[PDB]
RNA sequence: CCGCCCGUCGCUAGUACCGAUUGAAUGGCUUAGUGAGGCCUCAGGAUCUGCUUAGAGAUCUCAGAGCG
RNA sequence: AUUCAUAAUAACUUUUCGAAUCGCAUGGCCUUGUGCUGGCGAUGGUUCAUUCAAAUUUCUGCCCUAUCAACUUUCGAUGGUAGGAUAGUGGCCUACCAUGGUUUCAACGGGUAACGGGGAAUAAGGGUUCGAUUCCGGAGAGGGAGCCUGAGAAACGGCUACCACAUCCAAGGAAGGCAGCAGGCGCGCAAAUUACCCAAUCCUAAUUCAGGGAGGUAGUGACAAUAAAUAACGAUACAGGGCCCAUUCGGGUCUUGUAAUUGGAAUGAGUACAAUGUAAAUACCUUAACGAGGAACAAUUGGAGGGCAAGUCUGGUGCCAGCAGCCGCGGUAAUUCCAGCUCCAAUAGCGUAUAUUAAAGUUGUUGCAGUUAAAAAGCUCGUAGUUGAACUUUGGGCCCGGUUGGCCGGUCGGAUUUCCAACGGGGCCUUUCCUUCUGGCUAACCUUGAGUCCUUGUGGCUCUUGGCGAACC
RNA sequence: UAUCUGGUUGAUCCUGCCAGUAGUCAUAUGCUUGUCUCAAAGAUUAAGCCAUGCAUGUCUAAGUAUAAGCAAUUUAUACAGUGAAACUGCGAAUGGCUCAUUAAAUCAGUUAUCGUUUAUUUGAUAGUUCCUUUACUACAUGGUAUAACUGUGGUAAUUCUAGA
């Protein structure tokens, strides 16, 4: 209707922000940013709902406007800034560090990380082309272009990004024998290393994946994003380890064993 | 406008309203347990109905099925924690059987009478609806409740109001002060 | 009054706002309601920061009686409390004083009148004076 | 069987249809004729404003003319 | 998959960009001058990607109607050529050329009390009806048409004209739009206050400090729902079971009901100190001080012939008035009318309309009927449509091998462990084709070095000088 | 919660309706009306008309402020505390409202743009323009205006505006 939509209601926003139906009509529309609208998570949502630091929007703004907190080690003062997958949220509150990584149920958990891990992040290369004056370049899932890459780095691979500098510290190739995370959709927040790839002419390369318990499954390659070598993940994984328990194991562990 | 607060009615009326068999039998329950309306009975039979149809839907599928197991165990365990179904028949086929009498037994109106102290069920209801009695620290004022098994031994008079302790009341204030003490000028 | 017994459950320290945030639970048999002012007086026994520096807000009584739940804050210094706490709570605490100005629709009317005048508007008055 | 019942005829009320009206009103579509208004262009140049051979006495209008 | 990214030549530009921008702390240097360099930002800045999107677009599906069988082709119909136009492909539009495209597997027209979905109502299963309405998408802000400005509009709380309504007026002109909030009039069977407030949830701005009937907060609210007060307990007088220790002739707990006979006890509804609640209040939740024993603080709404539960009780009326969804009641004894007594239903909620779902296997695919009840077309041909014989590799084994339950329970009801029957799998051989061929493999090991730390078990951990290319592309 | 029941006959069994029956986020309407929670509420005739008021404005350390403003600068005859007004830049195309038209159109699921625009965020990004880079005009950084403003008015009138 005659241009961009600036407002956004509750309900229209995704289920994995854990937005309660009541206590408001509207939701925070994520601002135009690196990540997409539906996949990403606003900073306000990360603060008041998850971490429980702020109560109101006021308080959130008052926290953000005094610098302190920063995504990618950069000021980032806007309220509804889209913090997406695999982002370092550096805070000065008792030297606390946070990595956004997916959970069992496809949400963003409060997963703390070490001060050494805060240095670097990862990124799935979406295209690699020549820019102006024949200079090749890559582009990650979060738009962080890197000039003068290694010729080994082709499409669908992962890059380790240094944050402090826009550089390629490492790269990992796309095949079996590597630890392989999976985002997007039904099998969102799982790990199973790849068994084998499938070509399919005319788009959509369904990859076959096999977790630690050998409960194999298939997902689409656009939502697949690797991580590291077998038994050597370059990022510290959360509780659950990208396995996904059935409802039986849930009723055994999460409402029987854990009780006092 | 925001999202709606959802709602759905708990009572479910019968098909044939004037029937000699149903009207005579259902009113006995109402007289024994001390239920004010037929609406309460219908509510209880509606919850029971839902449980029944759920059980039937569980049973149409095969044994050793993920859907049938989980849901069965939770349904059965729900019916156990409330105390309607005892420990002997924890089989899922037995929850289909059941009866309305057990449900009314498990209501807090009559559990005060089944303990004792309240003499009549009607008197017990009065006690409950007049802010007396309590499950533990938490006070309850509603005849219908469903006592959750563990709660049974903790049922007694509340700290506020008499029997438990505290002040006497209004009538006793008037007898002690306005009548007994007020004789001497 | 009897027992009283303040219990600050679900304690979170908040370095980024310089405060602590917590759930005040109170056991008050033999008295009607909890009273915020009394809790402000008596919360300094555990934390020690006078009263206005601390703050609190946020309560509700449990069903039946004898008990009250609530949600509250404790700021470290007074200045921080002043700058981070919402403006309306300060009035309740007695620190700030809200300028009780005109009605909302009245202000809107004023705004419309100001829209209807171009520039400063003293020129119009002067023009009228020359006219008569 | 004195049983039932079928229709021509008189009688109260309605009901559609037909319709005197070369009814009347309102709509969409359209023959022919007319067509404002901006928008785009062919022109037009009220006016404002730079430059210059050049006008006046040692970023001065005092003549104009050209170049814009 | 490309005339792609990209580069390099020959060009043109009527000229895109390359900061004449602004703020905080003020230093570090040099043969020492208002000298040379200098951090932390903010806002601009062309291209490229990214984000927000936008625009077009593939396939597949939609309510009734043949008393709507031919439509589209004129000044666009379907297709081609070349241009113009667009951010763009493209009959989108020009000039030329061609004669196509749709269709009874139902086009084209007409109707819709038709915005489309997500859904809702009902429910055995299948269905039928509704979806203006809290979310997504569309369209329009009286009717049409055109346009400025911006990245974005054909915007309407922007403009422009004409049409229809309609306002101020000195008649000279000037200003209009609520299908935003709250209201007023109309039409109505039908619907709320010209209220408070940005404290929330968001949004906009040069932006933590402003603004927002976006929204939130009260009110009005029997549209709908949830819980749920409308009275419990004794004593005395009645027809009783008769119980406790069973010393059967001691006195009262439980009482089944009926009794304005009576004695205390517990409360709310309601009034309100205070506090809480809140942007600020009202409520709620609390709770001092108050507030039950009867016209008190009283509950009704429909029925009482049958369907359908409850009356052949009492008086009036006398086919009159009336009741009656249906059948039927009323002509002077009315179990149906009018009242009153008593009773029944539902019970702060019932009745009455109109629409609709179920029952309606009275639309029927599941699942109707068609001799006589409505219904088989006079009979045959015949195009579409629907349906249409059988027959084109089963068996046998060999192993490998997961799932069921019990002795093996040597672990303390679970199962270490395999014989055992059944149940599904995977290889191989049986004339049986499970696409082939080539560079990395010479891989599923005829290549074998010592083959052994394995009850005289072809059931199972290792390894040298090296062999049959699909286990992957 | 896979259900029936009265009505045509003198009595029967049928076809077949009629009426009963329960539900309704489908409405109205009658009577009655104490509490708590929760709540849709000018859609249906009429996208018929509307008094009047309000609903989109916008500031930081950081674009322009000799307001002939306020309170004073006590580092300021360059302003250099605050700051109405106006200029500039953004916003006003989001929202909220209604459903009149609209039947392969919107629409859902589903692709595609190798037929494209994309403000703004986000990340990268033009040392080669005085094309006589031999004097060429300043690059210690230059010109054209113009609102607010002071003052003179026009009209019956509107967030009408004229000169200087």
Swiss-Prot record, chain A:
The modification Phosphothreonine is found at residue 114. One of its GO terms (molecular function) is structural constituent of ribosome. Disulfide bonds: none annotated. Component of the small ribosomal subunit (SSU). Mature yeast ribosomes consist of a small (40S) and a large (60S) subunit. The 40S small subunit contains 1 molecule of ribosomal RNA (18S rRNA) and 33 different proteins (encoded by 57 genes). The large 60S subunit contains 3 rRNA molecules (25S, 5.8S and 5S rRNA) and 46 different proteins (encoded by 81 genes). It holds the Pfam family KOW. Gene3D superfamilies: 2.30.30.30, 2.40.50.740, RNA-binding S4 domain (3.10.290.10). SMART domains: S4 (SM00363). PROSITE patterns: RIBOSOMAL_S4E (PS00528), S4 (PS50889). Residues 41-104 form the S4 RNA-binding domain. Component of the ribosome, a large ribonucleoprotein complex responsible for the synthesis of proteins in the cell. The small ribosomal subunit (SSU) binds messenger RNAs (mRNAs) and translates the encoded message by selecting cognate aminoacyl-transfer RNA (tRNA) molecules. The large subunit (LSU) contains the ribosomal catalytic site termed the peptidyl transferase center (PTC), which catalyzes the formation of peptide bonds, thereby polymerizing the amino acids delivered by tRNAs into a polypeptide chain. The gene is RPS4A. There is a cross-link at residues 61, 133, 160, 167, 173, 178, 210, 232 (Glycyl lysine isopeptide (Lys-Gly) (interchain with G-Cter in ubiquitin)). It comes from the Eukaryota. GO terms for cellular component: 90S preribosome; cytoplasm; cytosol; cytosolic small ribosomal subunit. Belongs to the eukaryotic ribosomal protein eS4 family. This is Small ribosomal subunit protein eS4A. Signal peptide: none annotated. Present with 573 molecules/cell in log phase SD medium. There are 2 genes for eS4 in yeast. It is found in: Cytoplasm. One of its GO terms (biological process) is translation. Keywords: Cytoplasm, Isopeptide bond, Phosphoprotein, Ribonucleoprotein, Ribosomal protein, RNA-binding, rRNA-binding, Ubl conjugation. The modification Phosphoserine is found at residues 31, 246.
From Swiss-Prot, chain B:
The keyword Ribonucleoprotein applies. GO terms for cellular component: 90S preribosome; cytoplasm; cytosol; cytosolic small ribosomal subunit; nucleolus; nucleoplasm; small-subunit processome. GO terms for biological process: maturation of SSU-rRNA from tricistronic rRNA transcript (SSU-rRNA, 5.8S rRNA, LSU-rRNA); ribosomal small subunit biogenesis; translation. Keywords: Cytoplasm, Isopeptide bond, Nucleus, Phosphoprotein, Ribonucleoprotein, Ribosomal protein, Ribosome biogenesis, RNA-binding, rRNA processing, rRNA-binding, Ubl conjugation. GO terms for molecular function: rRNA binding; structural constituent of ribosome. There is a cross-link at residue 179 (Glycyl lysine isopeptide (Lys-Gly) (interchain with G-Cter in ubiquitin)). The modification Phosphoserine is found at residue 183. Pfam families: Ribosomal_S4, S4. It is found in: Cytoplasm; Nucleus, Nucleolus. Residues 159-185 are annotated as: Disordered. Gene3D superfamilies: RNA-binding S4 domain. Residues 106-180 form the S4 RNA-binding domain. InterPro entries: Ribosomal_uS4, Ribosomal_uS4_CS, Ribosomal_uS4_euk/arc, Ribosomal_uS4_N, S4_RNA-bd, S4_RNA-bd_sf. Component of the ribosome, a large ribonucleoprotein complex responsible for the synthesis of proteins in the cell. The small ribosomal subunit (SSU) binds messenger RNAs (mRNAs) and translates the encoded message by selecting cognate aminoacyl-transfer RNA (tRNA) molecules. The large subunit (LSU) contains the ribosomal catalytic site termed the peptidyl transferase center (PTC), which catalyzes the formation of peptide bonds, thereby polymerizing the amino acids delivered by tRNAs into a polypeptide chain. NCBIfam families: PRK04051.1, uS4_arch. Present with 106000 molecules/cell in log phase SD medium. Belongs to the universal ribosomal protein uS4 family. This is Small ribosomal subunit protein uS4A. It comes from Saccharomyces cerevisiae (strain ATCC 204508 / S288c) (Baker's yeast). The gene is RPS9A.
UniProtKB/Swiss-Prot annotation, chain C:
InterPro entries: eRP_eS24_sf, Ribosomal_eS24, Ribosomal_eS24_CS, Ribosomal_uL23/eL15/eS24_sf. SUPFAM superfamilies: Ribosomal proteins S24e, L23 and L15e. N-terminally acetylated by acetyltransferase NatA. Also partially acetylated by NatC. The modification Phosphoserine is found at residues 13, 55. GO terms for cellular component: cytosol; cytosolic small ribosomal subunit; mitochondrion. GO terms for biological process: cytoplasmic translation; maturation of SSU-rRNA from tricistronic rRNA transcript (SSU-rRNA, 5.8S rRNA, LSU-rRNA). There is a cross-link at residue 20 (Glycyl lysine isopeptide (Lys-Gly) (interchain with G-Cter in ubiquitin)). One of its GO terms (molecular function) is structural constituent of ribosome. Pfam families: Ribosomal_S24e. Residues 101-132 are annotated as: Disordered. Keywords: Acetylation, Cytoplasm, Isopeptide bond, Phosphoprotein, Ribonucleoprotein, Ribosomal protein, Ubl conjugation. The modification N-acetylserine is found at residue 1. Residues 104-114, 123-132 have a biased composition (Basic residues). It is found in: Cytoplasm. Component of the ribosome, a large ribonucleoprotein complex responsible for the synthesis of proteins in the cell. The small ribosomal subunit (SSU) binds messenger RNAs (mRNAs) and translates the encoded message by selecting cognate aminoacyl-transfer RNA (tRNA) molecules. The large subunit (LSU) contains the ribosomal catalytic site termed the peptidyl transferase center (PTC), which catalyzes the formation of peptide bonds, thereby polymerizing the amino acids delivered by tRNAs into a polypeptide chain. Component of the small ribosomal subunit (SSU). Mature yeast ribosomes consist of a small (40S) and a large (60S) subunit. The 40S small subunit contains 1 molecule of ribosomal RNA (18S rRNA) and 33 different proteins (encoded by 57 genes). The large 60S subunit contains 3 rRNA molecules (25S, 5.8S and 5S rRNA) and 46 different proteins (encoded by 81 genes). Belongs to the eukaryotic ribosomal protein eS24 family. There are 2 genes for eS24 in yeast. PANTHER family: 40S RIBOSOMAL PROTEIN S24. This is Small ribosomal subunit protein eS24A.
């Amino acid at each position: 209707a005659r241009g961009p939509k600036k407002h956004l209601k509750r309900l229209a926003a995704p289920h994995h922000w854990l937005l309660d139906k009541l206590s408001g009509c509207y939701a925070p529309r994520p601002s135009a940013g690196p990540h997409k609208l539906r996949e990403s998570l606003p900073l306000i949502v990360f603060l008041r709902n998850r971490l429980k630091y702020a109560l109101n929007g006021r308080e959130v703004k008052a926290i953000l406007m005094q610098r302190h907190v920063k995504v990618d080690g950069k000021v980032r003062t806007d309220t509804t800034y889209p913090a997406g997958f695999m982002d370092v949220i550096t805070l000065d509150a008792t030297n606390e560090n946070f990595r956004l990584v997916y959970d069992v149920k496809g949400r963003f958990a409060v997963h703390r990380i070490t001060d050494e891990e805060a240095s670097y992040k990862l990124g799935k290369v979406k295209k690699v082309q020549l820019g102006k004056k024949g200079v090749p370049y890559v582009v990650t899932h979060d738009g962080r272009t890197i000039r003068y890459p290694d010729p080994n780095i082709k499409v669908n691979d992962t890059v380790k990004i240094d944050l402090a500098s826009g550089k390629i510290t490492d790269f990992i190739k796309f095949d079996a024998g590597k630890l392989v995370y999976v985002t997007g959709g039904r099998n969102l927040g799982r790990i199973g290393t790849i068994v084998h790839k499938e070509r399919h002419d005319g788009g959509f390369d369904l990859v076959h994946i096999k977790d630690s318990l050998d409960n194999t499954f298939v997902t689409r390659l656009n939502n697949v994003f690797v991580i590291g070598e077998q038994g050597k993940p370059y990022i510290s994984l959360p509780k659950g380890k990208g396995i996904k328990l059935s409802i039986a194991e849930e009723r055994d562990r999460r409402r029987a064993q854990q009780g006092l | 406008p925001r999202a709606p607060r959802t709602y759905s009615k708990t009572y479910s009326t019968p098909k044939r309203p004037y029937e000699s068999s149903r009207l005579d039998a259902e009113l006995k329950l109402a007289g024994e347990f001390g239920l004010k309306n037929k609406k309460e009975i219908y509510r209880i039979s509606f919850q029971l109905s839902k449980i029944r149809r759920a059980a039937r839907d569980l049973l149409t599928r095969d044994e050793k099925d993920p859907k049938r197991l989980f849901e069965g165990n939770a349904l059965i365990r729900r019916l156990v924690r409330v105390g309607v179904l005892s420990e002997d028949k924890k089989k899922l086929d037995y929850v289909l059987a059941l009866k309305v009498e057990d449900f009314l037994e498990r209501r807090l109106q009559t559990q005060v009478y089944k303990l004792g102290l309240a003499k009549s069920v009607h008197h017990a209801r009065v006690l409950i609806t007049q802010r007396h009695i309590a499950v533990g620290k938490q006070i309850v004022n509603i005849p219908s409740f469903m006592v959750r098994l563990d709660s049974e031994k903790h049922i007694d008079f509340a700290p506020t109001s008499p029997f438990g302790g505290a002040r006497p009341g209004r009538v006793a204030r008037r007898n002690a002060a306005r009548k007994a003490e007020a004789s001497g000028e | 009054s009897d027992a009283v017994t303040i219990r600050t459950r679900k304690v979170i320290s908040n370095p980024l706002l310089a405060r602590k945030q917590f759930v005040v639970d109170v056991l008050h048999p033999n008295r009607a309601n909890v009273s915020k002012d009394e809790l402000r007086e008596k919360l300094a026994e555990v934390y020690k920061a006078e009263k206005d520096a601390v703050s609190v807000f946020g309560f509700r009584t449990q069903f039946g009686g004898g008990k009250s739940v609530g949600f509250g804050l404790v700021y470290n210094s007074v200045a921080e409390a002043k700058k981070f706490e919402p403006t309306y709570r300060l009035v309740r605490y007695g620190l700030a004083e809200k300028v009780e100005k005109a009605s909302r629709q009245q202000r809107k009317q004023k705004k419309n009148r100001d829209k209807k005048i171009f520039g400063t508007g003293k020129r119009l008055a002067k023009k009228v004076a020359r006219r008569n």
